[PDB]
Design a protein around this ligand. Sequence first.
Ligand SMILES: *[C@@H]1O[C@H](CO[C@@H]2O[C@@H](C)[C@@H](O)[C@@H](O)[C@@H]2O)[C@@H](O[C@@H]2O[C@H](CO)[C@@H](O[C@@H]3O[C@H](CO)[C@@H](O)[C@H](O)[C@@H]3O)[C@H](O)[C@H]2NC(C)=O)[C@H](O)[C@H]1NC(C)=O
Ligand SMILES: *[C@@H]1O[C@H](CO)[C@@H](O[C@@H]2O[C@H](CO)[C@@H](O[C@H]3O[C@H](CO)[C@@H](O)[C@H](O)[C@@H]3O)[C@H](O)[C@H]2NC(C)=O)[C@H](O)[C@H]1NC(C)=O
Lengths: 439, 102
Amino acid sequence: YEHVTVIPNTVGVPYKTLVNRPGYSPMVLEMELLSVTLEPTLSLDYITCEYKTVIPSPYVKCCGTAECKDKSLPDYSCKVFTGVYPFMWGGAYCFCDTENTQLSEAHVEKSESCKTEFASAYRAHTASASAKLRVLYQGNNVTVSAYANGDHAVTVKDAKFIVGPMSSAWTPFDNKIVVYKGDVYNMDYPPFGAGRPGQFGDIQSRTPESEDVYANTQLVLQRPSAGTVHVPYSQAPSGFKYWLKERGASLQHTAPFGCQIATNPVRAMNCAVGNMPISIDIPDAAFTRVVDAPSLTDMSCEVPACTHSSDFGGVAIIKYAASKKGKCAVHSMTNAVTIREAEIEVEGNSQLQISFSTALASAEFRVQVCSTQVHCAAECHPPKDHIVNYPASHTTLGVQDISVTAMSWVQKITGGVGLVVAVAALILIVVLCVSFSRH
Amino acid sequence: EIRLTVPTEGLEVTWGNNEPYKYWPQLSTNGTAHGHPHEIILYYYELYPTMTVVVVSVASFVLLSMVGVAVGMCMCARRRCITPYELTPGATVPFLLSLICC
Ligand SMILES: *[C@@H]1O[C@H](CO[C@@H]2O[C@@H](C)[C@@H](O)[C@@H](O)[C@@H]2O)[C@@H](O[C@@H]2O[C@H](CO)[C@@H](O[C@@H]3O[C@H](CO)[C@@H](O)[C@H](O)[C@@H]3O)[C@H](O)[C@H]2NC(C)=O)[C@H](O)[C@H]1NC(C)=O
Ligand SMILES: *[C@@H]1O[C@H](CO)[C@@H](O[C@@H]2O[C@H](CO)[C@@H](O[C@H]3O[C@H](CO)[C@@H](O)[C@H](O)[C@@H]3O)[C@H](O)[C@H]2NC(C)=O)[C@H](O)[C@H]1NC(C)=O
């Protein structure tokens, strides 16, 4: 028997679905999502890291003029400074006083730290969905890890569960993703080869192992101070270091729908978005004929207390006459009321207790137990607590979902005005009919 | 001391390196259903401060408008049933018409 149901894409909240196969005792399955993971396909564009500026010992040509060659190094500059008269600890470097030239050169390359400290610029595409689902099947708790792309059936005590596809394609990740360590950012990083000095992407490399480095650091060689051999320069400080200080909050803290973010692999977890269809294939061997199952008659529902709190603050007591001892499925016939128990044990002439949660001011609902329905009704009171640490176990209310007395007052007022209009309309019609009758 | 507002969808708060705290609102009221008309409005107002005001404001407007219509129809009927008498050179108004409409 194939059963298709849909549950809200929430985590930590159980949902109950009724499997109704006429001629057989009904089954109620309680399904709870424990984890939902969206894992985006990533394509690395480039990585960034702190650069080091390499400055080879300066060449001082005494009593002559030095010249430099162009090089292909990532960000290379060379300059020859004339009129240099450098000193060493033991005295002037060389014989000539003014006829001296110094050749300064430098290039930018990835530091050794880039193997550990780097950010990866990824292109994000579609995401593969997977989920961990808790299923209460015939009184037993089975946890199944399965893909949620609608293409994976996982067996629960010989029943097959197919999860997904998810109804929402929404992801917390934008097309451009930058990953540092455990932190993922939605940053619109520059194209490779289009970096800017002092900004993220000032130094870029396609892969961690690549020798191919793009750099734009504005490295400018300056003239050395008199009497010295040092090589001064003006360069924009690593944009990686600046970025690390200016990162701001990561998606783990800023994402919509309460999404949790993790890396290695990049994952969006437990996003409260849309809903998730589940298809369940239950073998005939799992069904018990109604003639073998317990059957209840002479049922009556009374609700001694009701609070419309997020938790199961409502309690209902239902009288029953059971034909035989055994377990019996319990189902709510209305979306407005959630029942905590999936099944109860019943025998003889007695009463059963069930707990429920509703947002209704007036709880009017039916309960089906072993294919026998009862009608429950109660006046529910508000909670005194303002805040809780858990999500509601009940659905939200529609505009039509109002208290019994509120409906009565609306009918009295609406009827009162409608009556006045109906009377005025009647008088006008009668007068017009008289006016038409007269010539 | 920080006062944070909690949305119906819930609020997540992270304090330092501690695991995040999650909070959700309850449907708490000082008004009540199954009470007097003003207690019922308060109940729904506190739970749904904008939906309740819109529904009450619109419903009240429409109900008052319908009363205005009922009165306008009565005045129209009044003019139509009276005019034919006021134009009569020896007009005499029947007591019932005089009492009911005039
Ligand atoms: C099927 O599983 C549900 C949910 O519990 C899940 O399985 C358990 C074995 C654990 O691994 C859980 O971490 C996991 O979520 C069971 O319902 C849960 O039962 C436990 C008791 O076993 C309840 O905890 C109690 O809660 C009260 C009130 O706070 C405390 O006073 C108690 O000290 C104790 O902590 C838990 O609240 C309840 N959860 C729900 C949603 O009802 C269920 O009983 C189990 N069924 C079977 C046949 O195993
Ligand atoms: C139902 O009525 C309650 C009062 O009868 C009200 O509780 C009170 O609400 C006020 C805010 O409106 C809180 O703040 C006031 O009091 C504190 C000191 O306790 C001051 O610091 C504040 O500045 C302010 O004056 C009260 O603390 C709070 N008192 C109690 C006992 O709760 C409820 O909030 C009302 N419920 C609803 C749904 O409106």
